[PDB]
């Protein structure tokens, strides 16, 4: 597979994401630690062996990652490493166009009413405002095999639809929430109920600072992920899925959920 995959194609990310798979072994959902080196291995080999050399960032990602060993990645680093789709890549590369949460932004801007997660229909149409923009037209071999791969790889209770880690897998890991958020995962039970803490206006909806709450809460909890240097900063964060500055929990039921609702 990886010896074919690797040495193959203009590799779409559903496929990517197979010789991904192949090493990402956690399941972090990121390639974690020393499978980098064991895909790197691989890499290096599909090279070698299918005799095409290791390209200066295939070989670098061997010369700089190749010791990442406490390392991770998301798709972001590793598919321009793979040359999985350049032109594809551009709305990839919409995620961090600026930000790994501004984007976010963007994200629910499109959905219906802001469901929390875009629906079939609706990240069927995400890509349509991102073709818009991408100053492309971000082609069908672009289009649907990127809004696919969002819309399998991290479905979430496999509905047709879009919830942020695929999209933030495929979000630059830099000033994102969205790793730590994955290992900061309360459960979805204790989401539901910390909600309802947060909700201490009884509103039934929360707002931008009772959101600092929700991370004074989850720092004090998870502080190995979540350090109070950037826990208002977790607030910028969450604050852009939400809408207006008052957050209506849909929206932020995917980061600190688990990976789900």
């Given at each position: 597979m990886?010896?074919?995959?690797?040495?193959?194609?203009?590799?779409?990310?559903?496929?990517?994401?197979?010789?991904?798979?192949?090493?990402?072994?956690?399941?972090?959902?990121?390639?974690?630690?020393?499978?980098?080196q064991?895909?790197?291995?691989?890499?290096?080999?599909?090279?070698?062996?299918?005799?095409?050399?290791?390209?200066?960032?295939?070989?670098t990602?061997?010369?700089?990652?190749?010791?990442?060993?406490?390392?991770?990645?998301?798709?972001?680093?590793?598919?321009?490493?793979?040359?999985?789709?350049?032109?594809?890549?551009?709305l990839?590369?919409?995620?961090?166009?600026?930000?790994?949460?501004?984007?976010?932004?963007?994200?629910?801007?499109?959905?219906?009413?802001?469901?929390?997660f875009?629906?079939?229909?609706?990240?069927?149409n995400?890509?349509?405002?991102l073709?818009?923009?991408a100053?492309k037209?971000?082609?069908?071999?672009?289009?649907?095999?990127?809004?696919?791969?969002?819309?399998?790889?991290?479905?979430?209770?496999?509905?047709?639809?879009?919830?942020?880690?695929?999209?933030?897998?495929?979000?630059?890991?830099?000033?994102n929430?969205?790793?730590?958020?994955?290992?900061?995962?309360?459960?979805?039970?204790?989401?539901?109920?910390?909600?309802?803490?947060?909700?201490?206006?009884?509103?039934?909806?929360?707002?931008?600072?009772?959101?600092?709450?929700?991370?004074?809460?989850?720092?004090?909890?998870?502080?190995?992920?979540?350090?109070?240097?950037?826990?208002?900063?977790?607030?910028?964060?969450?604050?852009?899925?939400?809408?207006?500055?008052?957050?209506?929990?849909?929206?932020?039921?995917?980061?600190?959920?688990?990976?789900?609702?």
């Amino acid at each position: 597979m990886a010896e074919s995959h690797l040495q193959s194609s203009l590799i779409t990310a559903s496929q990517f994401f197979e010789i991904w798979l192949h090493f990402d072994a956690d399941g972090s959902g990121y390639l974690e630690g020393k499978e980098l080196q064991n895909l790197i291995q691989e890499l290096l080999q599909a090279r070698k062996k299918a005799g095409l050399e290791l390209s200066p960032e295939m070989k670098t990602f061997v010369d700089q990652y190749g010791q990442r060993d406490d390392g991770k990645i998301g798709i972001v680093e590793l598919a321009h490493v793979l040359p999985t789709e350049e032109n594809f890549l551009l709305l990839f590369r919409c995620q961090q166009l600026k930000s790994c949460e501004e984007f976010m932004k963007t994200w629910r801007k499109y959905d219906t009413d802001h469901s929390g997660f875009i629906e079939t229909e609706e990240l069927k149409n995400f890509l349509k405002d991102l073709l818009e923009k991408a100053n492309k037209t971000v082609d069908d071999t672009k289009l649907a095999e990127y809004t696919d791969l969002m819309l399998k790889l991290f479905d979430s209770n496999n509905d047709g639809k879009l919830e942020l880690t695929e999209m933030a897998r495929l979000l630059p890991v830099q000033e994102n929430f969205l790793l730590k958020f994955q290992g900061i995962k309360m459960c979805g039970k204790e989401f539901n109920k910390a909600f309802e803490l947060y909700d201490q206006d009884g509103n039934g909806y929360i707002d931008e600072n009772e959101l600092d709450a929700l991370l004074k809460d989850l720092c004090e909890k998870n502080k190995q992920e979540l350090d109070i240097n950037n826990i208002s900063t977790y607030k910028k964060n969450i604050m852009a899925l939400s809408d207006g500055g008052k957050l209506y929990r849909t929206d932020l039921a995917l980061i600190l959920s688990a990976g789900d609702n």
